[PDB]
Structure formats: structure tokens, C-alpha cells
Amino acid sequence: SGFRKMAFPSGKVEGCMVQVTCGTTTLNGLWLDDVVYCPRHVICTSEDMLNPNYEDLLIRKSNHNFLVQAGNVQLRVIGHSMQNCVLKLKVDTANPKTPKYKFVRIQPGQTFSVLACYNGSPSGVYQCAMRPNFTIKGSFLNGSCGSVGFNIDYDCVSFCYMHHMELPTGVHAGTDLEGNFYGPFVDRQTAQAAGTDTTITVNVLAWLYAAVINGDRWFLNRFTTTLNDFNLVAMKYNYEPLTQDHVDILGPLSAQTGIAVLDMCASLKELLQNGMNGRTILGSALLEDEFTPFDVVRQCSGVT
Amino acid sequence: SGFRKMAFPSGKVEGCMVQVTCGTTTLNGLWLDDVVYCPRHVICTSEDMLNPNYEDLLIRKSNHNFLVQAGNVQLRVIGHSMQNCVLKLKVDTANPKTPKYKFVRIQPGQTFSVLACYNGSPSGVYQCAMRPNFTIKGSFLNGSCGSVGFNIDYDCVSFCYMHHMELPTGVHAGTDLEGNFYGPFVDRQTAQAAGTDTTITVNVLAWLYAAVINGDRWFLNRFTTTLNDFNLVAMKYNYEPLTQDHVDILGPLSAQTGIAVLDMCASLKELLQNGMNGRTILGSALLEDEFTPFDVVRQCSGVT
Ligand SMILES: Cc1ccncc1NC(=O)C[C@H]1C[C@@H]2C[C@@H]2C1
Ligand SMILES: Cc1ccncc1NC(=O)C[C@H]1C[C@@H]2C[C@@H]2C1
Structure with a gap:
């Protein structure tokens, strides 16, 4: 629960x-x-x-x-x-x-944990997502550079991020563990603007499934939609386009709840068009996009 | 940032x-x-x-x-x-x-981290707050009992919580490390209802200070208020009463931003009376109450 x-x-x-x-x-x-x-x-x-x-x-x-x-x-x-x-x-x-470790270059929309450090010492840990514009919305002050982002599969740590920069807008930029920046950012004190921060649609859908599993069902409607119809709405609200690949990875959540992926897309569509009307979902008043379908499965099943 | x-x-x-x-x-x-x-x-x-x-x-x-x-x-x-x-x-x-460790019994409104575990193995870590009704809104499945809540002061771990129960409403109940439950809960499979979950006012104020420090200032108004005037509004919106003790601990945040505590209370008052109007503060569309004034100071200064 x-x-x-x-x-x-x-x-x-x-x-x-x-x-x-x-x-x-x-x-x-x-x-x-x-x-x-x-x-x-x-x-x-x-x-x-x-x-x-x-x-x-x-x-x-x-x-x-x-x-x-x-x-x-x-x-x-x-x-x-x-x-x-x-x-x-x-x-x-x-x-x-x-x-045991691996170095992996993640794709946008993927989540990871950051161990924020100063002077080689940990200050705290939080969960992040590689934004579609290749920035991360972290919590980093001067001295936090070199802090890393990672995922863990039982005993193997997959390092995916190393913090390098704070853009003039307060968002963060960094590299994979091979030194290649995510996005077009360069390690220089030059104003570098970020692109559109679109919403990670597949992650929002995964989080709506997490909400149904945990009891929040008010947003479930009597409607369905198609990938093309949904995507017209997603484009309007700066949501990433949903593909059959995204539908495929939502399969175990769709199977657990008995709610078809396209039905959940229609619930998301109405949430985008009508708002929350002062209501909340999993204690949030906005649509959370930093839980992947894999994060939802892991948390909802108790993977250690 | x-x-x-x-x-x-x-x-x-x-x-x-x-x-x-x-x-x-x-x-x-x-x-x-x-x-x-x-x-x-x-x-x-x-x-x-x-x-x-x-x-x-x-x-x-x-x-x-x-x-x-x-x-x-x-x-x-x-x-x-x-x-x-x-x-x-x-x-x-x-x-x-x-x-190095201590066993401490925390007061409601205080925050702590939970290391969720299953079969003696960690699955994840998240930040919690002891609610004013002595429940915690955690993420625990069967097998997570015995997972602990803690705070860390440099090298000393202060254990404050041990997970014992899931109430029929999906909220969580547990004890300090001396075995005494927070709240009136008993370790028995009997329906036990929770009291009013009021908002931790001092924590919301601390988070408004964190927002000003990090650039979100739209909610700052041209008004001030008094403890008694503010508390009439706080009672109406199921917010905990604010005391001079709470004002005192907000002092370093008030000093850093140059915004008097009572001025921030007037900003919070207008936010309660008018809502957010589709806007966000620190990426949230609701007033966050699970950061203490101490958490804000620690995070905003980089304490390790
Ligand atoms: C000040 C701060 C706060 C948080 N995270 C990172 C920083 N530091 C920087 O952004 C410095 C950049 C410019 C120079 C080429 C390096 C990176
Ligand atoms: C099922 C579950 C999920 C998450 N956290 C805890 C639990 N377990 C319980 O609530 C069992 C209670 C009844 C018995 C006296 C003990 C506590």
C-alpha cells in the first residue's frame, strides 16, 4: 500500500x-x-x-x-x-x-537515483529522470560536481550519470561515465539554453496504473482512444508521442489491472483536457512523469 | 539550484x-x-x-x-x-x-528517511514525515515490517521508526525503537481508523522559503498578517496551528531571504484562500509539507 x-x-x-x-x-x-x-x-x-x-x-x-x-x-x-x-x-x-558495476548511457524518460555529494561525502539521495531535453531537474550546489546517477539490478550498479553543470535556468547537465554529455551541452561557462521539456507520456501512464493499483480510481472514465487520436492530444499538451513500444512495456501493468493501455490513454486524455478539478492522484495535484513502467512494477511487487 | x-x-x-x-x-x-x-x-x-x-x-x-x-x-x-x-x-x-546510533522518539511534523526492506534486503529509500495523526504515508507491502525510519547527523544514525502495520486505509503505523507505537495504534488485525491528517504548517512555510531561495517567487504578495489572524485561516484549512516556537525555527530562512515569517504566513494565507490558479511551486501543484525548516537549511547549504 x-x-x-x-x-x-x-x-x-x-x-x-x-x-x-x-x-x-x-x-x-x-x-x-x-x-x-x-x-x-x-x-x-x-x-x-x-x-x-x-x-x-x-x-x-x-x-x-x-x-x-x-x-x-x-x-x-x-x-x-x-x-x-x-x-x-x-x-x-x-x-x-x-x-559489481556497468557503465550505461540512458535514454530520455529513464529514471535513476542521484547520490548528491560534497567534498567526496554524501549529503542525500533522490530519484531523477533524464528529461526529453537531456537535462535533469536535480538539487545540486557548487561542489556537487562528480556526483553520480545510477540504477541497481540486484547486486550490479549501472552508473548512468555524472553531474557537471548547472544551466543559467537552474536545471542540470552532465555526462554518462564515458564522459559524453547527455544533450548538446558543453562543459563551458557559456549560456546554454535548454529545449522544450516535454512530459514523459509512458511514465505518466505507468503512474496512472500505480494509482489504480493503490486505490486512486476517480480518473478512470468510460472512454477509449487510438494511438493516433491520443497523440494529437499529447502533441497539444507537450507530451512525448506514445509508440507501440511504450504500449508493449505497459503490458504487465495493463494485465495486472485489467485496464487496456488505450483505455488508460483515454483517461489521460480527459485529465489533460479537463484538469484535475482540485483533486489529487497519489497525493500529487499534477501528472507525475518520473516513474517508468519498470519502476512501478518494481515498487508494486517489492523487488530487492 | x-x-x-x-x-x-x-x-x-x-x-x-x-x-x-x-x-x-x-x-x-x-x-x-x-x-x-x-x-x-x-x-x-x-x-x-x-x-x-x-x-x-x-x-x-x-x-x-x-x-x-x-x-x-x-x-x-x-x-x-x-x-x-x-x-x-x-x-x-x-x-x-x-x-554510531541513538534511538529517538520523534514528534509529529518531523521528517525521516525510510529504508524499505524485504527478507532483510533493501528495496529502496524515500523521505517521510510523521503525520499529525501519527501515521506515515509510506510505501510498504507484506514482508516490509521491521523496515526502519532514521535521520543522520554527520556520522550518527538516529533511528526513529520501525514499520509494523498497514491500516485498512493504506496508511502506515509503527513504533519508535523502544517498541512504543506512534499514535493510538495497537499491533492487532483490528480496524483502527486514523484521525484528521492536518497539514504541517511550519513545514509548508519552510518549503515556501526553499522556493524563494530557488527562484519561484510568484506567490509572494504585498501583505502581512498576525499569528492569531493566520491561525484562524489555518484552522479553516486543517493546517496545524503556528506557534512562536515554529516562527523561531524559521528564523534562519527568514534571515537568508529577508522575508519576515509573518509576511510568508500572509503569502501562505492567500495561497490557501485563492489556490495556485494552475501554477506550480518547486514543480508541485500543491503545498508540500514534508520538508522541515531543518531539511530546507541542510539541503540549501549542502550539509554532508
Ligand atoms: C555552480 C554549480 C552548481 C551546481 N552544479 C554545478 C555547478 N557548476 C557549474 O555549473 C560550473 C560549470 C561551468 C564550468 C564548466 C564547468 C561546469
Ligand atoms: C500487509 C502489510 C502491508 C504493509 N505493511 C504492513 C503489513 N502488515 C500488517 O499490517 C499486519 C498487521 C496486523 C498484525 C499485527 C501485525 C500488523
Whole structure:
């Protein structure tokens, strides 16, 4: 009973957080095996950040300029390389707390947990979604760079995000663990505007299924619709187009509740056209889009 | 930038979760030092649960009837006692992962993180608040009993909640770590109705301060009010009465933003009387009450 914005247990990721200092800049690093991963902008000063040439800036840096601290102990840096927008610092010791892990580049609409850190130390954990404009609506202050986004499948941590930037609008930008930014963002102190933040339609539908499962049924109507009819409405309300792929992954939720996917789309259509009328769904007065169909199944079944 | 419903890092609590089985019932236990804490209803069968006499039921249980498993290894039970509604199972081994900890009984309106578990294993972490009717709006399925609520002050874990029940309305009831239930609930399969779930006024004000800090200012008005005037409005909208104590703890937020507490109360008053008019505050279309003034300060400053 009850449905909550739930994050993965953060322990496996806490054991990987370290503090990386280069010159006067301190941010977070992710220590897995004998490698520490961090944003390459750790090598920048405030003047460098305007238009930095990272290859040129990295020439003046040696292994001994990167100070890596795990807890209160210093790690010895025996190598350093730049991969896209991340620096990989080879240390002489494998992290004894290295969990089983993968590096995955997620698609927009996918959710993940963020372990927000400062000075290599965790401050908190929350659940995020890669927005369709490739930004994330996080909670990050100066010093949080290098904090990571992840998912967990039983014992394997899939790292998907590393925090790098705060856009002038207060939304966040970052890379996968190979250093490639999500979206068109560049690691530079230049105004970069975000594109349209559309609603993740499949996630809203998954959350309407979670609501039916947990007792909130007022929004269920006597109507049905078609993919094409629904999508005309979704385009009007800046909702992502729904595909047969999205319908397919909603199948187990559709089967559990006995509510066909297209019927739920018609409920969503009326919710878009008429609003909530001062009512709530799962304690929210708006349509929640940061639960994937997989998150709903996991939470509603108790996967550990 | 950005404000999120953030939970504490869960690692220190994950290292304490174990599985407790008694007869055919399996739930979660909290292993701290050489003691495992769990709900006493682990000794009940489905027939016992209607009107259980726990003292009588515990007479038929010996140390060897309580199966405690931490990971894949079995803990030896050398003692067992009942304290209010929790069982304390003395084991022969201190938990090597025991963090620094305290047991605290929280007041309504206070927030905490829940590490939801099944079979001694973590499934996820979310942020909760002890409602003014002493229930929590969690996300718990059968097998989640024994999951705990906690806060963290640097390295010390303050355990405040242990999950015991799901009321017939889908809201949750439980105890502090001394086994005393929050509210009037009893650990029995009897319909127990909850009282009025009032809104935590001080928390809503703290969240309006978080919104001003993060850029959402549309709700700021040209008005002020008094404690007595505000409270007449708060009573009408089932909001908890605001006291000078609540005003005092909002002081650092009032000082940071330069917005007097009574001015913010007048903004809240107009929000209650006029609604949001289809607008949002920190991505919410309703007034969020599960951030304490302390949570806002912590998040907005980056406390780790
Ligand atoms: C100030 C802050 C708050 C939260 N998250 C991140 C930041 N930092 C930045 O955005 C700095 C950017 C500019 C320079 C190339 C690097 C990234
Ligand atoms: C079924 C479920 C789901 C989520 N959280 C808890 C539960 N379990 C119960 O409520 C059983 C109660 C009755 C018996 C005396 C014990 C507590």
C-alpha cells in the first residue's frame, strides 16, 4: 500500500565516493577498481571556464597535481587520462568496496537515483529522470560536481550519470561515465539554453496504473482512444508521442489491472483536457512523469 | 539550484538490515551491536493476529525458534526479550557494520528517511514525515515490517521508526525503537481508523522559503498578517496551528531571504484562500509539507 518517489539504496555508491582536488578546485570522484572518474573541469580555474582548452590545460597537470582522498586517507595517483569530458585517474589501489558495476548511457524518460555529494561525502539521495531535453531537474550546489546517477539490478550498479553543470535556468547537465554529455551541452561557462521539456507520456501512464493499483480510481472514465487520436492530444499538451513500444512495456501493468493501455490513454486524455478539478492522484495535484513502467512494477511487487 | 525530496544516504542502515523468521512468518530486523530489533508480531500466525496475547505467544518460543540471517550467514540467538511491541534478540556476534546510533522518539511534523526492506534486503529509500495523526504515508507491502525510519547527523544514525502495520486505509503505523507505537495504534488485525491528517504548517512555510531561495517567487504578495489572524485561516484549512516556537525555527530562512515569517504566513494565507490558479511551486501543484525548516537549511547549504 502507498506509492512513493523511491531511490535505490545508496550504500554501494557511497563506498565509491572520493574527493578530487586539482589546484584550488575540489569536486567529487567515483572510485571503481583502480580508477577514479571525475569531471574534467576540475583542472579549470574561474578564468579558464569561459573558453577552456582542456587538452592545453591538462598539459600543465601531472599525476601529483590530482589530490584524491577517500575518507581521511590519500590515494596515490599513478596515471591520468582524459576521456571526452571526464578524467580517469589511475590510482595504485583498487577500491576494496567496488561493487559489481556497468557503465550505461540512458535514454530520455529513464529514471535513476542521484547520490548528491560534497567534498567526496554524501549529503542525500533522490530519484531523477533524464528529461526529453537531456537535462535533469536535480538539487545540486557548487561542489556537487562528480556526483553520480545510477540504477541497481540486484547486486550490479549501472552508473548512468555524472553531474557537471548547472544551466543559467537552474536545471542540470552532465555526462554518462564515458564522459559524453547527455544533450548538446558543453562543459563551458557559456549560456546554454535548454529545449522544450516535454512530459514523459509512458511514465505518466505507468503512474496512472500505480494509482489504480493503490486505490486512486476517480480518473478512470468510460472512454477509449487510438494511438493516433491520443497523440494529437499529447502533441497539444507537450507530451512525448506514445509508440507501440511504450504500449508493449505497459503490458504487465495493463494485465495486472485489467485496464487496456488505450483505455488508460483515454483517461489521460480527459485529465489533460479537463484538469484535475482540485483533486489529487497519489497525493500529487499534477501528472507525475518520473516513474517508468519498470519502476512501478518494481515498487508494486517489492523487488530487492 | 533545484530542490528535491531527498533522503539520507542509506548505507549505514543497509549494513544493519537482517531477516528474522519465526515459524512461518518472515520480516526485517535491525542489527545494532549484539542485538536484533524486530516487530513482536513476527511470533504471530494469521489466526493469532485477530486478538494476540503476545506474552502467552512468547512463552512457546525459545532462542532457537528465531532464525536471524544477515546476508547469507546465520546469527546465533542467545537471548530474547519483549520491550513494548518490539522483540530484542540477543545474538552472539556484534554487527561489525554497527554505525554510531541513538534511538529517538520523534514528534509529529518531523521528517525521516525510510529504508524499505524485504527478507532483510533493501528495496529502496524515500523521505517521510510523521503525520499529525501519527501515521506515515509510506510505501510498504507484506514482508516490509521491521523496515526502519532514521535521520543522520554527520556520522550518527538516529533511528526513529520501525514499520509494523498497514491500516485498512493504506496508511502506515509503527513504533519508535523502544517498541512504543506512534499514535493510538495497537499491533492487532483490528480496524483502527486514523484521525484528521492536518497539514504541517511550519513545514509548508519552510518549503515556501526553499522556493524563494530557488527562484519561484510568484506567490509572494504585498501583505502581512498576525499569528492569531493566520491561525484562524489555518484552522479553516486543517493546517496545524503556528506557534512562536515554529516562527523561531524559521528564523534562519527568514534571515537568508529577508522575508519576515509573518509576511510568508500572509503569502501562505492567500495561497490557501485563492489556490495556485494552475501554477506550480518547486514543480508541485500543491503545498508540500514534508520538508522541515531543518531539511530546507541542510539541503540549501549542502550539509554532508
Ligand atoms: C555552480 C554549480 C552548481 C551546481 N552544479 C554545478 C555547478 N557548476 C557549474 O555549473 C560550473 C560549470 C561551468 C564550468 C564548466 C564547468 C561546469
Ligand atoms: C500487509 C502489510 C502491508 C504493509 N505493511 C504492513 C503489513 N502488515 C500488517 O499490517 C499486519 C498487521 C496486523 C498484525 C499485527 C501485525 C500488523
